[PDB]
Design an enzyme around this catalytic site. Structure first.
Site, short mmCIF file in Angstrom:
data_model
loop_
_atom_site.label_atom_id
_atom_site.label_comp_id
_atom_site.label_asym_id
_atom_site.label_seq_id
_atom_site.Cartn_x
_atom_site.Cartn_y
_atom_site.Cartn_z
N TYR A 1 6.67 84.04 -1.29
CA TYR A 1 6.59 85.46 -1.56
C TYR A 1 5.34 85.96 -2.29
CZ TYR A 1 11.51 85.59 -0.28
OH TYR A 1 12.71 85.51 0.40
N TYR B 1 21.89 87.23 -3.99
CA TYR B 1 20.87 86.46 -3.31
C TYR B 1 21.48 85.21 -2.71
CZ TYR B 1 16.87 83.86 -1.93
OH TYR B 1 15.95 83.16 -1.18
N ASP C 1 28.86 81.01 -3.70
CA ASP C 1 27.53 80.38 -3.59
C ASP C 1 27.09 79.89 -4.97
OD1 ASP C 1 24.86 79.70 -3.35
OD2 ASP C 1 24.29 81.49 -2.21
C1 LIG Z 1 18.32 78.91 -4.26
C2 LIG Z 1 19.39 79.82 -3.72
C3 LIG Z 1 19.66 79.78 -2.37
C4 LIG Z 1 18.65 79.38 -1.32
O1 LIG Z 1 18.27 78.06 -1.36
P1 LIG Z 1 16.93 77.49 -0.69
O2 LIG Z 1 16.88 76.04 -0.94
O3 LIG Z 1 15.82 78.31 -1.32
O4 LIG Z 1 16.94 77.83 0.77
C5 LIG Z 1 20.83 80.34 -1.92
N1 LIG Z 1 21.68 80.86 -2.83
C6 LIG Z 1 21.48 80.98 -4.13
C7 LIG Z 1 22.58 81.60 -4.95
C8 LIG Z 1 20.31 80.39 -4.63
O5 LIG Z 1 20.01 80.57 -5.89
#
Ligand SMILES: *Cc1c(COP(=O)(O)O)cnc(C)c1O
Ligand SMILES: *Cc1c(COP(=O)(O)O)cnc(C)c1O
Ligand SMILES: [K+]
Ligand SMILES: [K+]
Lengths: 429, 428
Positions: free
Chosen positions: B17, B144, B244
């Site tokens: 980015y 995110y 997540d």
């Molecule tokens: C880091 C992150 C991701 C994405 O992981 P990458 O290895 O960058 O593709 C997805 N979800 C959350 C909550 C994260 O912090």
């Protein structure tokens, strides 16, 4: 490894595209070296698959091992935000120098599917910066570009079962799979479908995306190089970007360093994976032109909007650099050339077997397409019993051995393929 | 690294980015050890970031190193189609044992974003197999979940600039960002979420959220009652809950998994980052037997996903070694002591003119500023203070390795406080 360990795997561990309620046997591997896989019980198998294209130098390669351990002693990983490091710079130098001139900007990533997503996002962001309403991708049927959402949207709809996601995935444009063979003649009737779609959708296409020369997971198809030349020029005339997915074809597997070289063309965006690290661990790279990379950065966002956590991973870049250094000798050209003649000569007899529909060979890729689907559990057992690791799928019994394979080892693989197709014992399911 | 090497990086290598037409300085790192990064000029920097959450044990860890070298000696990689191996089985044993009871089916993948894509495909395939028309995801604003297209579709539309892709991305449902702070609970915080659930409960495949901490979307810390309520709502409607925990997993918030703050189990759990001890990329998506069997008994006859390097022996061996360090339980008091020190030492940023808010949870300390930082000038300021702190937008935050020494942690908090005293390092 115990039988309790194998029960745990069956009950709790998903494997690539295979049932959890009716899983077939998986073979326990404890180690690998040279061109062999070593099972838990001690049985040694000649690897016919390169662990799905990637292990072009085989297993436990001294140079890859030495580079990986040396990098571990420095740092296995460090973030790439605001930081750079030698493994990434060396690797990108090598990728920029070994690919066509215009491809001089590299976006490193973690897997093939993510590299395709990056390519598709670069095409979408590129046009958005230019003020053009281009969001569609024109691809071919029988294509395979990965398993994430964006990648799935340009994969063959029938092969990938797009009905499962109907209404969720974006609907792209699918030209017929190329018919003219790599072995055979050019047929200009092959272009009509592609031309009709381009004519109808030229103003909304962001990019054309294809696998150059070999359509891997979609059918192990080998088509004529004239197609790429024609596509490149149409993209040039129309102003459309060309994305070449060389995740399976890159790094000498089809006889040329990059399969685009067969047509003497360069794409606007190039995707690489698999074999990039010598099949030691995951890494990918998406290369593009300065025109694309600067246009995106001049748009509203001020940058290309992507950045995986492990971007530029020093360990995987050091493994990729060692793998590319082995290729710099040019020894792969002769190795691949030799493998190609042996596959042609030794798979030729299979054309007369009753279960065989077609035999096609290109570089270190040898394919025997059958008339009926293989019986996965039975045929896999047969191969293991013949001391070979050959992983068939559907109607395809194919080989893509490490480039270092010995002639005696290659002959054991081809002997096994010919024996498998002599009758219907291992066919249907 | 030569001067020419750095010039090559500037003009030919993209970084996360950041602009290719107005590139900002990058610092050349040659090695790393303990909690320090070593630049090419020999300067040592205390790492305040853990290379973005993942390096919870620091760098050049003798146990992680030995486990990776030993697995390189056996085999760094072998395909997982038709094959299994000890590193994968041992990792899946640990992941199943350490997560909530229902979570017992593991799908290993290569990166966090892919683990989220996998979770989203599980939910879709699950309902397809049950014959229900359910393709919407309900999520929170400021979330995110990654950078690939399916993951992008549940990321904050404003933060992630969805206008760039409008028409390509599926349209999901976005409830207000959780207001109640990690703070008293306000029942009115739920209105927006209830409105969406009532209107679209028939169509929602899953709810997907980052439990307790919204990371890349704002470093926000919310009340655990939200998770309790969301689990109950999902249960009542029969909707899947995807948690997540790619950033919050493996002890960072003070509990092994942040879902523990509410004593809740999601139907699908995504893990990444810190799974390997920040040595190399690997991810995992766990789900229940109900989900996994239902999918396999559907028309596809399997879960339709399988990355080339799925189950990579080397990365699994690193994750096993990282998890074996956590098995000691030493991380619990280490994170608890870090949280105290962050609270105490970032408290003074509450007297600074450039601060909007200060918030700490476990081994996470955030100083939200009133104005965007000047990335180049502030990054250089930190490097000169002998620290590696990587700010973004209006956030200056710390997530150090669990093994960080108090004196190193103090250099980080002192540097943060000094950066927010006046406008020098702000705007650009
Ligand atoms: C880091 C992150 C991701 C994405 O992981 P990458 O290895 O960058 O593709 C997805 N979800 C959350 C909550 C994260 O912090
Ligand atoms: C293998 C492959 C992919 C996807 O790579 P993964 O590492 O599985 O995500 C992409 N495109 C093609 C042509 C491939 O062969
Ligand atoms: K180039
Ligand atoms: K569990």
């Amino acid at each position: 490894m115990t039988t309790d360990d194998l029960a745990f795997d069956q009950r709790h561990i998903l494997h690539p595209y295979t049932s959890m309620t009716s899983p077939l046997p998986v073979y326990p591997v404890v180690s690998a070296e040279g061109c062999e896989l070593i099972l838990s019980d001690g049985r040694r198998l000649v690897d016919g698959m390169s662990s799905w294209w990637a292990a072009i130098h085989g297993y436990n390669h001294p140079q890859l091992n030495a580079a990986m351990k040396s990098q571990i002693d420095a740092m296995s990983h460090v973030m790439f935000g605001g930081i750079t490091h030698a493994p990434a710079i060396e690797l990108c130098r090598k990728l920029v120098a070994m690919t066509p001139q215009p491809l001089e900007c590299v976006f490193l990533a973690d897997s093939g599917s993510v590299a395709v997503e990056v390519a598709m996002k670069m095409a979408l962001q590129y046009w958005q910066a230019k003020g053009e309403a281009r969001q569609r991708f024109l691809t071919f049927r029988n294509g395979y570009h990965g398993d994430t959402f964006g990648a799935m949207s340009v994969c063959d709809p029938d092969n990938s079962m797009h009905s499962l996601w109907k209404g969720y995935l974006p609907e792209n444009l699918f030209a017929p799979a190329p018919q003219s063979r790599m072995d055979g003649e050019w047929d200009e009737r092959d272009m009509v479908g592609f031309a009709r779609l381009m004519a109808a959708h030229r103003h909304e296409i962001a990019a054309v995306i294809i696998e150059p020369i070999v359509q891997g997971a979609g059918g192990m198809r080998m088509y004529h190089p004239e197609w790429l030349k024609r596509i490149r020029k149409i993209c040039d005339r129309e102003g459309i970007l060309l994305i070449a997915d060389e995740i399976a074809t890159g790094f000498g597997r089809t006889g040329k360093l990059f399969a685009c070289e067969h047509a003497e063309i360069a794409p606007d965006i190039l995707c690489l994976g698999k074999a990039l690290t010598g099949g030691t661990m995951t890494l990918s790279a998406t290369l593009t032109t300065r025109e694309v990379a600067e246009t995106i950065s001049n748009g509203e966002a001020g940058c290309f909007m992507h950045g995986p956590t492990f971007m530029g991973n020093p360990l995987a870049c050091a493994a990729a650099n060692a793998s590319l250094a082995i290729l710099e000798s040019g020894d792969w050209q002769q190795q691949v050339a030799d493998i190609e003649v042996q596959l042609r000569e030794q798979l030729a007899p299979a054309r007369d077997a009753e279960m065989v529909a077609d035999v096609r060979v290109l570089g270190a890729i040898g394919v025997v397409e059958t008339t009926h689907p293989v019986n996965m559990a039975a045929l896999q057992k047969f191969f293991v019993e013949q001391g070979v690791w050959i992983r068939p799928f559907g109607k395809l019994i194919y080989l893509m051995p490490p480039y270092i394979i010995l002639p005696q080892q290659l002959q054991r693989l081809t002997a096994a393929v010919n024996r498998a197709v002599q009758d219907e014992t291992f066919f249907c399911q």
